[PDB]
Symmetry: C3
Subunit: 248 residues, 3 copies
């Protein structure tokens, strides 16, 4: 565990990224190499897989001597990261000691000391899955549909056809459909190999999109009775990815 210094401009954007990921997980092992920071984790129900990739190109300073792996209490990390202001600089620094030093530089110099726990890593791989449908769309639409489907049901059907993406949720007698064509604003891109249907639990969906903003582009990939893969991009270089198991 050699020392490193990592620096990020915009402490608030970082917090909101960490907060999204932390919605599902509680402890995570961050891999720090000379190429970037990568975190890969499942939530306790072993239904969501989170994968964070922050290449070194999104950091204003990235001094990493030797590749190591630190364990972080995600909720404690978030309580601290939430004190960052939008124009603050975030500095994550480790010395010889077994804690993390999180510093905010702006109107003052605020320094926290975050104790480094140990996390047991699972053999977690991001496999190449045969997704038959791909969908880029505004977070605004996505956040909307999960909130609207929550009014009716616990699960949300996704239905992708050559020219229309559709979410649908059926309750005791109440029903909601959201429908999107390339003629719509919310829909940026739609690639369907074959007509594709699948369903996913709103509870998990609500937590994955909770930290996404109305303005962001989200990519969806999914297949008939296959995982849902949702990802968006951080400073157009970092990537946050969720893999979500279906309802069967």
């Amino acid at each position: 565990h050699m020392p490193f210094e990592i620096v990020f401009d915009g402490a608030k954007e970082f917090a909101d990224l960490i907060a999204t990921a932390s919605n599902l997980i509680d402890e995570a092992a961050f891999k720090i190499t000379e190429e970037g920071v990568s975190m890969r984790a499942m939530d306790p129900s072993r239904v969501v897989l989170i994968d964070l990739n922050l290449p070194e190109s999104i950091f204003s300073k990235y001094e990493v001597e030797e590749p190591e792996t630190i364990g972080i209490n995600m909720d404690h990390f978030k309580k601290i990261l939430k004190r960052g202001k939008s124009k603050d600089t975030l500095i994550l620094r480790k010395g010889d000691e077994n804690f993390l030093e999180i510093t905010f530089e702006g109107t003052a110099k605020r320094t926290f000391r975050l104790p480094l726990i140990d996390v047991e890593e699972l053999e977690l791989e991001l496999p190449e899955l045969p997704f038959t449908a791909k969908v880029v769309l505004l977070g605004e639409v996505l956040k909307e549909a999960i909130k609207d489907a929550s009014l009716v049901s616990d699960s949300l059907k996704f239905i992708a056809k050559e020219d229309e993406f559709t979410m649908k949720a059926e309750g005791e007698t109440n029903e909601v459909e959201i429908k999107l064509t390339l003629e719509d604003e919310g829909l940026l891109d739609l690639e369907v190999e074959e007509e594709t249907r699948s369903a996913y639990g709103i509870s998990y969906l609500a937590d994955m999109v909770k930290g996404i903003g109305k303005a962001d582009e989200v990519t969806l990939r999914f297949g008939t009775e296959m995982p849902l893969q949702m990802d968006y991009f951080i400073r157009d270089e970092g990537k946050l990815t969720f893999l979500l198991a279906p309802r069967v």
Copy 2:
């Protein structure tokens, strides 16, 4: 029995229904060729509400045959709360027995709302001998009710020739809200005789919860008489509360 009604400004429409459903729970909407109307009482039969929306405030108004539909107001409120200020609202009914609510904006979002049948009542609004008419900004009204709640649970209205007063007194505390024509918040006053009545704050509070700050509100009342309070939606639709006085 199909129809199609289109309203530009989904969020405005919600604010309207949300004002109505503060006191109502279930309503029959009368859909005719001239507009949509609804007349409901609250559970304690203290308040009559009367919503009229002429065809001229809808962008598209296609009604084949006049009809009446009953709506669970609370469910309808929940769905209407999902519209954005720039969405277009579409109220469509096919030959089936539910209500298609649709928001066209960044996406097409469609809800099916089951209809219900509603105990309708000998609901008529006779003209009553009001001796006082006040017109005032909504924020003056919302203020004086929120202020009065701190002291009492009744609000006394008192009109003389050139002063309008709301007064609320408790055991030791007391608040008074005086309005004269010189004040920006009063837009009009007409009093034929000195008028005094009192009304409950619980009901009043709920009547104005959904009223904008800069809305023009009209109050008509009379000594130991009901309080008629109305204000306009888009200058052509009208919302009326009739409120029973206190002893």
Copy 3:
């Protein structure tokens, strides 16, 4: 008739009373012709609090009868939270035992807040040998108190000739806020010798709750001495907390 005081900007006045009520329950106001003054302790007898409002901050200040009134701060605060930022606040004491509070804006609103008899103790705001003085933005100050609240119950303050340093430590975790004259949030630093003290966060939490981020706070303290926190009210008035230290 015994006095009439007028203050343009009711919400500004409210926010000031609201600051000094986070610690105080009852208080005696000394109304002289020079201005209004107020000096109270919190129930712990740990924070001394002292408010002074020179008559030059009031648009109208007529005092016939210099006297002293007693006020239930929570009741006063409930009323004062009803003034709008464009309201004119009026305080009238007539012959009787109540304080008439008026908001003049879009309407005339009047409250009668009943006065009370407060066991006014003898409170001297003494002079103390402070060795460190710091001026800084509320934003910094409120953050440090929130930050430090995630770790500990006390907050060390540490002034050296060049840097000001708040520091809170628990069993495992640590926060540390450091300010030099090169930082935008420090505006004045005057240190006579190296100074260190400690204070309860819970009390610091309430003293700053009502302070705006744009505000300018003056800290004076010395080793194991009270903490003196000033912030000014329209440049003429002064609010002053005095905070017994933690050992």
